[PDB]
């Protein structure tokens, strides 16, 4: 069968995985103890879904995941929680000390002494998999682990596994909000190394999801346990065709193709429009047109950027539930008739479309509502260059004075890596501005 390994690196990664696997365990029918109750019915069957869960002969389903944090505080909440009996006990802590929000530590100093032990486990899982396709990585630009250790691991896996998809789901840094002073450095240092190895990096931001949870869901005091539940739905919509049946199916190599024109502009966004409450589950039809128009509103983007300030280059639209393609065609016609939604001249073929039949599942204690139809929109837009223009400027301020640099040098780095990375990002800005130019011979 088909298999996809998930690599949740850092606090953000683990706290997203603890919801993603909470969701997968319900979509398929797995209890937290790993024991499916309704394996009564199989008589064969394939509902022990091999894309995420490996089955063993005792009637148990163990996930294809790896945890690593450089600190036990988060992983040890899994060992002590409700899903302690599911995961293989190789939930790799190495937390004698953490990265201290330093890329210098999570790359060489403490990033090594681990990576052998992570690769030995990834090798053990891959060999347990026949037709493996993809590496779903989960991390955060802004910390040291997610920044440096992920860079190292993606450097290694590009040598050990070669030409296999590597999709990063990353917490992008926000313009105004920040829980750290050294995200502008780590973000650039991670982009410089991951850009040559990754193949499509789906970005999110906490500020946008706060705005969504306020406006739509009516949550004025939201926390991470609301945001990660939505990110889990994004990943499930990405990983639905490999599990459930549909009319238009989508493999992982299709995102790597339909959304990456050039090998450095592989930084798209994410969107999930039906984030309405159970109250507003009524008072709304929730048709394909309403959703498809919501996904193109700059307010319901999961990344804080106005695509009116740029141009769309490609857009995948993954739908779940009672959808008919006539509705999608009508919706896309409405969207193409609109003038605020501009495209590049060299991409007249626009949208990738995908349909799956199984609708989303509601978690108890969640804020979403049971809706018959769901949508996930992942778009590549030049407007994100403006975000890169912000991060590159902050860098220029607190690097002219060489602030916080001695901490990085003190853990195995050089004053030149910063310049290298800044020049690569300045090159990427020009690469984002070039494609926006209209074609003339």
């Amino acid at each position: 069968m088909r298999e996809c390994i998930s690599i949740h690196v850092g606090q953000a990664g683990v706290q997203i995985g603890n919801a993603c696997w909470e969701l997968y365990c319900l979509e398929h029918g797995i209890q937290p103890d790993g024991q499916m109750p309704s394996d009564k019915t199989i008589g064969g069957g394939d509902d022990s879904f091999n894309t995420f869960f490996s089955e063993t002969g005792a009637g148990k389903h163990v996930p294809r995941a790896v945890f690593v944090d450089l600190e036990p505080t988060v992983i040890d909440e899994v060992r002590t929680g409700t899903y302690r009996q599911l995961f293989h006990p190789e939930q790799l802590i190495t937390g004698k000390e953490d990265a201290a929000n330093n890329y210098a530590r999570g790359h060489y100093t403490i990033g090594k002494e681990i990576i052998d032990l992570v690769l030995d486990r990834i090798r053990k899982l891959a060999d347990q998999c026949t037709g493996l396709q993809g590496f779903l990585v989960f991390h955060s630009f802004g910390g040291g682990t997610g920044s440096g250790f992920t860079s190292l691991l993606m450097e290694r896996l590009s040598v050990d596994y070669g030409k296999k998809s590597k999709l990063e789901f990353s917490i992008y840094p926000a313009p105004q909000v920040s829980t750290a002073v050294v995200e502008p450095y780590n973000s650039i240092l991670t982009t410089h190394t991951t850009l040559e190895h990754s193949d499509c990096a789906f970005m999110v931001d906490n500020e946008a999801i706060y705005d969504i949870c306020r406006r739509n869901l009516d949550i004025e005091r939201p926390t991470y346990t609301n945001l990660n539940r939505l990110i889990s739905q994004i990943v499930s919509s990405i990983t639905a065709s490999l599990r459930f049946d549909g009319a238009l199916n989508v493999d992982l190599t299709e995102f790597q193709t339909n959304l990456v024109p050039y090998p450095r502009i592989h930084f798209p966004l994410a969107t999930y429009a039906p984030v309405i409450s159970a109250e507003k589950a009524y008072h709304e039809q929730l048709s394909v047109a309403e959703i498809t128009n919501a996904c193109f509103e700059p307010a319901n983007q999961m990344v804080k950027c106005d695509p009116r300030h740029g141009k769309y280059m490609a857009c995948c639209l993954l739908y779940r539930g009672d959808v008919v393609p006539k509705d999608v065609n009508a919706a896309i016609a409405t969207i193409k008739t609109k003038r605020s939604i501009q495209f590049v001249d060299w991409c007249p073929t626009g949208f990738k479309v995908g349909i799956n039949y199984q609708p989303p599942t509601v978690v108890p204690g969640g804020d979403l509502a049971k809706v018959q139809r769901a949508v996930c929109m992942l778009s590549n837009t030049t407007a994100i260059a403006e975000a890169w223009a912000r991060l590159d400027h902050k860098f220029d301020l607190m690097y002219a004075k060489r602030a916080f640099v001695h901490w990085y040098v003190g853990e195995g780095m050089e004053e030149g890596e910063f310049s290298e990375a800044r020049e690569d990002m300045a090159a990427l800005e020009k690469d984002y501005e070039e494609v926006g130019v209209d074609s003339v011979e």
Partner: protein, 434 residues
């Protein structure tokens, strides 16, 4: 396995420790016999950060007392929480420093430092991994100034990979408590500036004004002042012990609070602080705490941030909160008070949250800040100093114990250079065009 070694040196240090080990032992469920009598199960997970285990499931703190007079030893032993410390760790001598940085750094401290290092090595080598060290010490006197700084210099040489925190009680502007505060403080700064990573400056007068204006206490003893210091101590080390949504440690805070290695002198503070009667008429929410913490009348350093610019601040929250209400609030401060912050650092605030608060409050918070206002703390000393040094006032009691006049000028110049380094970043000027 992020283990801390507490070193207590002098009356101030031991009297703060005797309150801090009452605060942590309460936060973890230990009694004066050293035994767990708690309710939860998170108290036992990371108890290794301060305590070590023994035969009968007893928990002995990793403390090292240093004081050079037996009076504080007996106060600790003849006390509430005295029979949990190890007797082989009550290191002490006789004939104290005499409010002299020289007697406690060359003459009497050199005759005892080996005995402290022999315990430090024992307690550090029994640790799986070590995060750093922890010293509470009053500069202004002797022992805490000299025999503290020497221990710092000898640990930093033995461990030039670990954190060395110093929770110091600096002298006050108006009223002194020792005539030779300037010399000793200057000679301690010359050793801390070069051998520390994050040093937290406390002042008796700021804490008296807190006790009078916020807590409405009329006659506050030092057990009340140290009750505020212990609160901040626990605030710094909550992420390592307890869990949280967004965690931190000493290394991460030091990374995100020290642009340059010399400017590691910070203003501590704690919320929510209130009088017993004015509790029923307040609301326990995040904005009230943020208003209490960034208030100049809630500092411990006796230096107003209105006369300077914050370079980098931290906020360790404890309780079930929402990260949106921290991000919004800490963005509001940067915007409404842009002049009190730096421009070449876009976001000056770090946030950390822990899901387990203090025993009596639904929510808590701890505030560290690196400001150019602590300039005023040193510029005063250098003014008190040089006058005396212009006359050689009280110096024959330090030269006699094996010191030279050069060691004073060196420290004075280092302090004044630190002043210049902090003052370079408090006059907001613009660029060519931008």
């Amino acid at each position: 396995m992020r283990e801390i070694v507490h070193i207590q040196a002098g009356q101030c240090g031991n009297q703060i420790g005797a309150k801090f080990w009452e605060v942590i032992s309460d936060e973890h469920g230990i009694d004066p016999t050293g035994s767990y009598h708690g309710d939860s199960d998170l108290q036992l997970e990371r108890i290794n950060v301060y305590y070590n285990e023994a035969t009968g499931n007893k928990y002995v703190p990793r403390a090292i007392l240093v004081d050079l007079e037996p009076g504080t030893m007996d106060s600790v032993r003849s006390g509430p929480f005295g029979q949990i410390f190890r007797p082989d760790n009550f290191v002490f001598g006789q004939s104290g420093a005499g409010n002299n940085w020289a007697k406690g750094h060359y003459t009497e401290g050199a005759e005892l430092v080996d005995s402290v290092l022999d315990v430090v090595r024992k307690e550090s080598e029994s640790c799986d991994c070590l995060q750093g060290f922890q010293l509470t010490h009053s500069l202004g006197g002797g022992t805490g100034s000299g025999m503290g700084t020497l221990l710092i210099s000898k640990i930093r040489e033995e461990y030039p990979d670990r954190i060395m925190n110093t929770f110091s009680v600096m002298p006050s502007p108006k009223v002194s408590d020792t005539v030779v505060e300037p010399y000793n403080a200057t000679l301690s700064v010359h050793q801390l500036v070069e051998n520390t990573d994050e040093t937290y400056c406390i002042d008796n007068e700021a804490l008296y004004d807190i006790c009078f204006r916020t807590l409405k206490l009329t006659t506050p003893t030092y057990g009340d002042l140290n009750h505020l210091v212990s609160a901040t101590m626990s605030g710094v080390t909550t992420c390592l012990r307890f869990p949280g949504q967004l965690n931190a440690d000493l290394r991460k805070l030091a990374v995100n609070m020290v642009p340059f290695p010399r400017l590691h002198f910070f203003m501590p503070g704690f919320a929510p602080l209130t009088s017993r009667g004015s509790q029923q008429y307040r609301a326990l929410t995040v904005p009230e705490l943020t208003q209490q913490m960034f208030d100049s009348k809630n500092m411990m350093a006796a230096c107003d941030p209105r006369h300077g610019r914050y370079l980098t601040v931290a906020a360790i929250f404890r309780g079930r909160m929402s990260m949106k209400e921290v991000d919004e609030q800490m963005l509001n401060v940067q915007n409404k008070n842009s002049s009190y912050f730096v421009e070449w650092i876009p976001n000056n605030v770090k946030t950390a949250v822990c899901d387990i608060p203090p025993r009596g409050l639904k929510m808590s918070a701890t505030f560290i800040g690196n400001s150019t206002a602590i300039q005023e703390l040193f510029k005063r000393i250098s003014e008190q100093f040089t006058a005396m040094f212009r006359r050689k006032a009280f110096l024959h009691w330090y030269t006699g114990e094996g010191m030279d006049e050069m060691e004073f000028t060196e420290a004075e110049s280092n302090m004044n250079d630190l002043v210049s380094e902090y003052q370079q970043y408090q006059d907001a000027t613009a660029d060519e065009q931008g």
